[PDB]
Design an enzyme around this catalytic site. Structure first.
Site, PDB file in Angstrom:
ATOM      1  N   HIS A 207       0.912  -0.708  -0.070  1.00  0.00           N
ATOM      2  CA  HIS A 207       0.299  -0.052   0.319  1.00  0.00           C
ATOM      3  C   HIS A 207       1.089   1.286  -0.038  1.00  0.00           C
ATOM      4  CE1 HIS A 207      -3.013   2.807   1.495  1.00  0.00           C
ATOM      5  NE2 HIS A 207      -3.812   2.228   1.045  1.00  0.00           N
TER       6      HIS A 207
ATOM      7  N   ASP B 133       1.113   4.445   0.929  1.00  0.00           N
ATOM      8  CA  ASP B 133       1.171   5.021   2.213  1.00  0.00           C
ATOM      9  C   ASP B 133       2.002   3.953   3.741  1.00  0.00           C
ATOM     10  OD1 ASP B 133      -0.133   7.016   2.010  1.00  0.00           O
ATOM     11  OD2 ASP B 133      -2.196   6.085   2.961  1.00  0.00           O
ATOM     12  N   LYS B 134       1.663   2.749   3.279  1.00  0.00           N
ATOM     13  CA  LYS B 134       3.572   2.006   3.941  1.00  0.00           C
ATOM     14  C   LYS B 134       4.385   1.404   3.823  1.00  0.00           C
ATOM     15  CE  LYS B 134       1.556   1.826   8.400  1.00  0.00           C
ATOM     16  NZ  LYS B 134       2.672   2.389   9.065  1.00  0.00           N
TER      17      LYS B 134
ATOM     18  N   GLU C 188      10.754  11.938   6.008  1.00  0.00           N
ATOM     19  CA  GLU C 188       9.923  11.904   5.786  1.00  0.00           C
ATOM     20  C   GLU C 188       9.428  11.475   4.238  1.00  0.00           C
ATOM     21  OE1 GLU C 188       7.592  12.208   8.039  1.00  0.00           O
ATOM     22  OE2 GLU C 188       6.946  14.679   8.480  1.00  0.00           O
TER      23      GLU C 188
ATOM     24  N   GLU D 294      15.285  15.827   8.094  1.00  0.00           N
ATOM     25  CA  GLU D 294      16.158  16.619   8.764  1.00  0.00           C
ATOM     26  C   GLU D 294      17.004  15.509   9.159  1.00  0.00           C
ATOM     27  OE1 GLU D 294      12.664  18.191   9.713  1.00  0.00           O
ATOM     28  OE2 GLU D 294      12.625  19.426   8.326  1.00  0.00           O
TER      29      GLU D 294
ATOM     30  N   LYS E 147      -5.669  -4.598   0.809  1.00  0.00           N
ATOM     31  CA  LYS E 147      -6.090  -3.962   2.263  1.00  0.00           C
ATOM     32  C   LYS E 147      -6.954  -4.864   2.391  1.00  0.00           C
ATOM     33  CE  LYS E 147      -8.663   0.681   1.747  1.00  0.00           C
ATOM     34  NZ  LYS E 147      -8.463   2.066   0.898  1.00  0.00           N
TER      35      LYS E 147
ATOM     36  N   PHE F 226      -7.055  -6.613  -9.505  1.00  0.00           N
ATOM     37  CA  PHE F 226      -5.663  -6.368  -8.743  1.00  0.00           C
ATOM     38  C   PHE F 226      -4.705  -6.566  -9.620  1.00  0.00           C
ATOM     39  CE2 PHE F 226      -5.437  -4.472  -4.450  1.00  0.00           C
ATOM     40  CZ  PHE F 226      -4.389  -3.398  -5.072  1.00  0.00           C
TER      41      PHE F 226
ATOM     42  N   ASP G  55      -1.294   6.344  -8.309  1.00  0.00           N
ATOM     43  CA  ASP G  55      -1.630   6.615  -6.813  1.00  0.00           C
ATOM     44  C   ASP G  55      -0.259   7.344  -6.326  1.00  0.00           C
ATOM     45  OD1 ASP G  55      -3.420   6.289  -4.569  1.00  0.00           O
ATOM     46  OD2 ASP G  55      -3.377   3.794  -4.507  1.00  0.00           O
ATOM     47  N   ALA G  56      -0.945   8.575  -4.978  1.00  0.00           N
ATOM     48  CA  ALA G  56       0.351   9.183  -3.839  1.00  0.00           C
ATOM     49  C   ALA G  56       0.154   8.517  -2.398  1.00  0.00           C
ATOM     50  CB  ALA G  56      -0.116  11.095  -4.308  1.00  0.00           C
TER      51      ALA G  56
ATOM     52  N   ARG H 118       0.975   8.327   6.788  1.00  0.00           N
ATOM     53  CA  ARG H 118      -0.489   8.579   6.580  1.00  0.00           C
ATOM     54  C   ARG H 118      -1.771   7.546   7.248  1.00  0.00           C
ATOM     55  NH1 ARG H 118      -2.475  13.169   3.127  1.00  0.00           N
ATOM     56  NH2 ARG H 118      -3.893  11.489   3.408  1.00  0.00           N
ATOM     57  N   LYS H 119      -1.113   6.414   7.645  1.00  0.00           N
ATOM     58  CA  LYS H 119      -2.126   5.994   8.201  1.00  0.00           C
ATOM     59  C   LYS H 119      -1.748   4.957  10.172  1.00  0.00           C
ATOM     60  CE  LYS H 119      -3.454   4.097   4.788  1.00  0.00           C
ATOM     61  NZ  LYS H 119      -4.224   5.519   4.083  1.00  0.00           N
TER      62      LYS H 119
ATOM     63  N   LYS I 176      11.616   8.619  12.830  1.00  0.00           N
ATOM     64  CA  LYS I 176      12.052   9.515  13.595  1.00  0.00           C
ATOM     65  C   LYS I 176      12.205   8.859  15.109  1.00  0.00           C
ATOM     66  CE  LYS I 176       7.292  12.439  13.279  1.00  0.00           C
ATOM     67  NZ  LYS I 176       6.086  12.377  13.728  1.00  0.00           N
TER      68      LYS I 176
ATOM     69  N   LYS J  86      11.977  12.412  20.043  1.00  0.00           N
ATOM     70  CA  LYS J  86      10.757  12.751  19.614  1.00  0.00           C
ATOM     71  C   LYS J  86       9.364  12.310  20.335  1.00  0.00           C
ATOM     72  CE  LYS J  86      12.915  14.554  15.404  1.00  0.00           C
ATOM     73  NZ  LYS J  86      13.919  14.371  14.759  1.00  0.00           N
TER      74      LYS J  86
ATOM     75  N   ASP K   1       6.468  11.965  20.386  1.00  0.00           N
ATOM     76  CA  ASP K   1       5.656  10.730  19.421  1.00  0.00           C
ATOM     77  C   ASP K   1       5.893   9.208  19.196  1.00  0.00           C
ATOM     78  OD1 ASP K   1       4.746  13.851  18.839  1.00  0.00           O
ATOM     79  OD2 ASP K   1       4.900  13.948  16.577  1.00  0.00           O
TER      80      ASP K   1
HETATM   81  C1  LIG Z   1      10.038  21.432  16.857  1.00  0.00           C
HETATM   82  S1  LIG Z   1       9.964  20.298  15.242  1.00  0.00           S
HETATM   83  C2  LIG Z   1       9.969  19.190  15.699  1.00  0.00           C
HETATM   84  C3  LIG Z   1      10.943  18.106  14.175  1.00  0.00           C
HETATM   85  C4  LIG Z   1      11.444  18.605  13.830  1.00  0.00           C
HETATM   86  N1  LIG Z   1      12.016  18.540  12.378  1.00  0.00           N
HETATM   87  C5  LIG Z   1      13.271  18.010  14.003  1.00  0.00           C
HETATM   88  O1  LIG Z   1      13.948  18.266  12.993  1.00  0.00           O
HETATM   89  O2  LIG Z   1      13.776  17.345  15.301  1.00  0.00           O
HETATM   90  C6  LIG Z   1       7.920  20.470  14.689  1.00  0.00           C
HETATM   91  C7  LIG Z   1       7.390  22.025  15.176  1.00  0.00           C
HETATM   92  O3  LIG Z   1       7.766  22.378  15.878  1.00  0.00           O
HETATM   93  C8  LIG Z   1       7.407  23.632  15.819  1.00  0.00           C
HETATM   94  N2  LIG Z   1       9.697  24.374  15.883  1.00  0.00           N
HETATM   95  C9  LIG Z   1       9.943  24.398  15.300  1.00  0.00           C
HETATM   96  N3  LIG Z   1      10.805  24.958  14.427  1.00  0.00           N
HETATM   97  C10 LIG Z   1      11.479  25.129  16.702  1.00  0.00           C
HETATM   98  C11 LIG Z   1      12.171  25.754  17.625  1.00  0.00           C
HETATM   99  N4  LIG Z   1      13.296  26.413  17.685  1.00  0.00           N
HETATM  100  N5  LIG Z   1      10.888  25.884  18.839  1.00  0.00           N
HETATM  101  C12 LIG Z   1      10.025  25.207  18.804  1.00  0.00           C
HETATM  102  N6  LIG Z   1       9.127  25.051  18.365  1.00  0.00           N
HETATM  103  C13 LIG Z   1       9.961  25.237  16.478  1.00  0.00           C
HETATM  104  C14 LIG Z   1       7.419  24.592  13.848  1.00  0.00           C
HETATM  105  O4  LIG Z   1       6.269  24.598  14.432  1.00  0.00           O
HETATM  106  C15 LIG Z   1       7.421  22.675  13.885  1.00  0.00           C
HETATM  107  O5  LIG Z   1       7.047  22.522  12.732  1.00  0.00           O
HETATM  108  K   LIG Z   2       7.536  16.819   9.764  1.00  0.00           K
HETATM  109 MG   LIG Z   3       1.867  17.185  16.103  1.00  0.00          MG
HETATM  110 MG   LIG Z   4       4.759  16.868  10.188  1.00  0.00          MG
END
Ligand SMILES: C[S@@+](CC[C@H](N)C(=O)[O-])C[C@H]1O[C@@H](n2cnc3c(N)ncnc32)[C@H](O)[C@@H]1O
Ligand SMILES: [K+]
Ligand SMILES: [Mg+2]
Ligand SMILES: [Mg+2]
EC number: 2.5.1.6
Lengths: 360, 381
Positions: free
Chosen positions: B15, B17-18, B43, B56, B167, B236, B244-245, B250-251, B271, B275, B277
């Site tokens: 899929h 997204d996966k 990403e 990043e 799916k 299929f 498809d994109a 996204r899942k 990540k 993070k 998350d």
């Molecule tokens: C902090 S980043 C998290 C992941 C980031 N891409 C990384 O490389 O670690 C995600 C969101 O935090 C907010 N953000 C970005 N730079 C920031 C900073 N220096 N201090 C606080 N918030 C920030 C932004 O709105 C951004 O969309």
């Molecule tokens: K991001």
């Molecule tokens: Mg968030």
């Molecule tokens: Mg994001």
């Protein structure tokens, strides 16, 4: 017998939300010319680059240059000093457009704790970002930049399943700024000119925790700081952690995709039940053949009526066939870019936010 | 107390997204194998003939991105234009930069392991439920395990005409019991899978019922009235990205609890541990499973929240759905005595600098045997 709960929201210049707006801007551009256009448009953003990918069936011929750059102009990225600029960014189009020649489980939710019929955590989170944007554009705080995030923790108590907001426990605000203003001045402004103008005074007290510019520096922002993608803010878009989610994103999809229109419909139902006096808090679950497979209503114990009784009211007042939904809610009109920031729910701008009178 | 219906979805490795989720984590694994402290935020974007990386990275590692990406597309099973995608001949484009110096001074530079600040703000959930030995909802366990069996039989040769995209959807009928949920019977199963040109549908529907469904769903939930929708949209042949994109993250309901519990909105793939998350969602799952497996309740929800640059949590909440002797406030106190949910300590307990992450990117991040966040902690109270 009290608890805490948290929700976040995000500004117009946040990289994920930039893509949600561009995605819905394209849908609007296509609909303005072809009311029956079919769109599935994904947007990706990083330093210097906006990229469009996906599929479209549409009679329209769209100027993607004007569409992307005008939206980036509206958001406020217009110089290299801000990390991004609509006049000089790269616009890559990988969309596949043709000439003309699903199922699921969606949720609706509502709560009588606010006029918006939405959790106070998210309502407040949204409103704080709107206030930042409003003071940036009118001149009051000229050091502010477009990228921002907010989150709000509220202390609650129960009462027969309903939730009663007692106090705001903690507020976070991080916002991209210019290079001239100092840290003390920023935290002072955020508290006095943004928070105190947005949160009703009864929720604020000497114990409330403030985390304002917690990183200590936020000059680099937008896509340069953080890659952005469509449909990566689905909880910001909907209920802030409350209720439930079946899992589809909204932006860049046309009304024939049930993920969007049936979700709006389920919000419509839930808001109608609460504002009709039938309960104080509710979850609506539609299972999906055009008629829905199943429907269940969870009222948390906030109704004198039974759950069978509410289902009967729902069936006697609503026709949730995607076909009919689209007609009653007027969803062929180009009104989708407005939905892509500050939440798709709890704003008195859209058709699914107008409650229906229930005759029973 | 009265019966109801619930459905969960799952998707296969192919899929679109996966695909992006798997590549993202394969890039994360490449970096961790050389530098355990690498900060990664990758990403992935997928569409007709293209894989794009954007994001990043700060890492002492040296990584061959073309090799890492193409190997994973091969691993997934796309090796020819007749399947809609070929790893040997697709376009791979890379837009990967250093992480923001602003972020780094706020989070990790000049700080102890235990004292690193949260990488971002946000909210996250944990959920658990005694309805399975897995401590996971039956709807989502079954939907995942169907997609796993498909990829297993495709890879080992048992059904060599199967292709990578699929799916599945599983509807279960439930009744309540003092806030808990009791799975009774399976009401509907839906399966679409990508296949070779040279097989008939009839034969395919037979293998799906007999080699796949029958070997995955215990017979007790299968009865005369169970509705089977096998290859419901017909042939299929072409799948994946073609026409498809797809995008990383996204899942996220498929990744977690299939509609059950709640979600905070943070994607997992691409990540590193800083993070929250990822790290804090993994820990929240650990807590929730420990409370249920400790006998303290039958079903539970757990919320946490963070602010960028701050090590400690901003909030913690416990919801037991009425399934406990003790109160929700009592359960919170037990959690606070037993767990330290600073990210610089979660990393140590769950071992999150190890390159295990490509495994997590299909068939769910939870309810899995070998993952650390699934070994429950014995609780003191
Ligand atoms: C902090 S980043 C998290 C992941 C980031 N891409 C990384 O490389 O670690 C995600 C969101 O935090 C907010 N953000 C970005 N730079 C920031 C900073 N220096 N201090 C606080 N918030 C920030 C932004 O709105 C951004 O969309
Ligand atoms: K991001
Ligand atoms: Mg968030
Ligand atoms: Mg994001």
């Amino acid at each position: 017998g009290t608890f805490l709960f948290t929700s976040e929201s995000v500004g117009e210049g946040h990289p994920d939300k930039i893509c949600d707006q561009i995605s819905d801007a394209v849908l609007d551009a296509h609909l303005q010319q072809d009311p029956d256009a079919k769109v599935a448009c994904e947007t990706v953003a990083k330093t210097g680059m906006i990229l469009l990918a996906g599929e479209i069936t549409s009679r329209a011929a769209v100027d993607y240059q004007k569409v992307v750059r005008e939206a980036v102009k509206h958001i406020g990225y217009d110089d290299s000093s801000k990390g991004f600029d609509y006049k000089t960014c790269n616009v890559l189009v990988a969309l596949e457009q043709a000439s003309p020649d699903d199922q699921g489980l969606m949720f609706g939710y509502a709560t009588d704790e606010t006029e918006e019929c939405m959790p106070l955590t998210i309502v407040l989170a949204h409103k704080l970002n709107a206030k930042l944007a409003e003071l940036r554009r009118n001149g009051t705080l000229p050091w502010l930049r477009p990228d921002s995030k907010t989150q709000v923790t509220v202390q609650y108590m129960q009462d027969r399943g309903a939730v009663l907001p007692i106090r705001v426990h903690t507020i976070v605000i991080s916002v991209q700024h210019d290079e001239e203003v100092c840290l003390d001045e920023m935290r002072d402004a955020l508290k006095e000119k943004v928070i105190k103008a947005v949160v009703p005074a009864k929720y604020l007290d000497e114990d409330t925790i403030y985390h304002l510019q917690p990183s200590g520096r936020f000059v680099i922002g937008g896509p340069q700081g953080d890659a952005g993608l469509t449909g990566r803010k689905i909880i910001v878009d909907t209920y802030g952690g409350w209720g439930a989610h079946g899992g589809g994103a909204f932006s860049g999809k046309d009304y024939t995709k049930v993920d969007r229109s049936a979700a709006y419909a389920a919000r419509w139902v839930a808001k109608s039940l609460v504002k009709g006096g039938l309960c104080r808090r509710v979850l609506v679950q539609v299972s999906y053949v055009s008629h829905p497979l199943s429907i269940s209503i969870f009222h948390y114990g906030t109704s004198q009526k039974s759950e069978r009784e509410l289902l009967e009211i729902v069936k006697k007042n609503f026709d949730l066939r995607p076909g009919v939904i689209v007609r009653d809610l007027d969803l062929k009109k180009p009104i989708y870019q407005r939905t892509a920031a500050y939440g798709h729910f709890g704003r008195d701008s859209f058709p699914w936010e107008v409650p229906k009178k229930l005759k029973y």
